[PDB]
Amino acid sequence: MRLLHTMLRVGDLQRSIDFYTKVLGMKLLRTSENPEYKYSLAFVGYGPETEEAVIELTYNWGVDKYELGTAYGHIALSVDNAAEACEKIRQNGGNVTREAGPVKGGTTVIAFVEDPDGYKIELIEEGN
Amino acid sequence: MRLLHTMLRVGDLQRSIDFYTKVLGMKLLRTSENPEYKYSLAFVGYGPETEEAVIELTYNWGVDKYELGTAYGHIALSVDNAAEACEKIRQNGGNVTREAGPVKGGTTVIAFVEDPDGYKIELIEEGN
Ligand code: NI
Ligand code: NI
């Protein structure tokens, strides 16, 4: 068994695709529409769904906002360069909630940011 | 770059750990506790953190309930036997919201369940 994906509802599909791919470096793997139930999907990721976990973005026609709640935490991604991502993210209008820097008591560089819908993302700069 | 984990706040750590490991077949990869911030964590997954995406279960001391909200969707996992999985889940702390079966106009078998805290999980099956 394997973990396939994490699905998040977004208020604007393209805005989200633009962010994940252009700002975070993922690729748009596939997209679909469901006319019957009025929603669209997009899968974004760093590699093929067959080999690894990705993100499923769901856009319900006409719905631009959701209630985030207090349960869901975040998604953590390995980042090539934390500082730069924060910069890209910021200048790209986003919010950096935790500037890049070594984590408390450790050495690993991490940062926290928010996507366009306010979801939190943890960036961690990390057989063979 | 890769997806590292998805973090979910849980009302009872062991309760969550038992569900993901005993019912879903994941393994407990690591744990930690932090007095400053008052929480404990458990990482569960089908492979080590360096090979796969996993789940970060967060238990905030003395907090046993959160607001799920309407934004967060689910986590999808592959399974060998959706029907069997559903049964195991419904009988061990979970709930089945969508019985195993093919998707309209498809043949791929899927189901939707809820874990002990209400989080949705999508089960995707991989001549009887
Ligand atoms: Ni995390
Ligand atoms: Ni899904």
From Swiss-Prot, chains A, B:
Family per similarity comment: Belongs to the glyoxalase I family.
Classification via Pfam families: Glyoxalase
Knockout consequences: Deletion of the gene increases the HOCl sensitivity. Mutant is more sensitive to methylglyoxal treatment.
Active site: E122
Role: Catalyzes the isomerization of the hemithioacetal formed spontaneously from methylglyoxal and glutathione, to S-lactoylglutathione, which is then hydrolyzed by a type II glyoxalase (GloB or GloC). Is involved in methylglyoxal (MG) detoxification. Involved in resistance to hypochlorous acid (HOCl), which is the active component of household bleach and a powerful antimicrobial during the innate immune response.
NCBIfam families: glyox_I, PRK10291.1
SUPFAM superfamilies, alphabetized: Glyoxalase/Bleomycin resistance protein/Dihydroxybiphenyl dioxygenase (SSF54593)
All copies of domain VOC, residue ranges: 2-126
Binding site for substrate: R9, N60, H74
Keywords recorded for this protein, A-Z: Detoxification, Lyase, Metal-binding, Nickel
Entry's EC annotation: 4.4.1.5
InterPro entries linked to this entry: Glyas_Bleomycin-R_OHBP_Dase, Glyas_Fos-R_dOase_dom, Glyoxalase_1, Glyoxalase_1_CS, VOC
Class of the enzyme per the UniProt entry, highest EC level: lyase
Protein name as annotated: Lactoylglutathione lyase
Subunit (UniProt): Homodimer.
Binding site for Ni(2+): H5, E56, H74, E122
Ranges that cross the membrane: none
Induction record: Repressed by NemR. Induced by reactive electrophilic species (RES) such as quinones, glyoxals and methylglyoxal. Up-regulated by HOCl.
Details of cofactor binding: Binds 1 nickel ion per subunit. In the homodimer, two nickel ions are bound between subunits. Is not active with zinc ions.
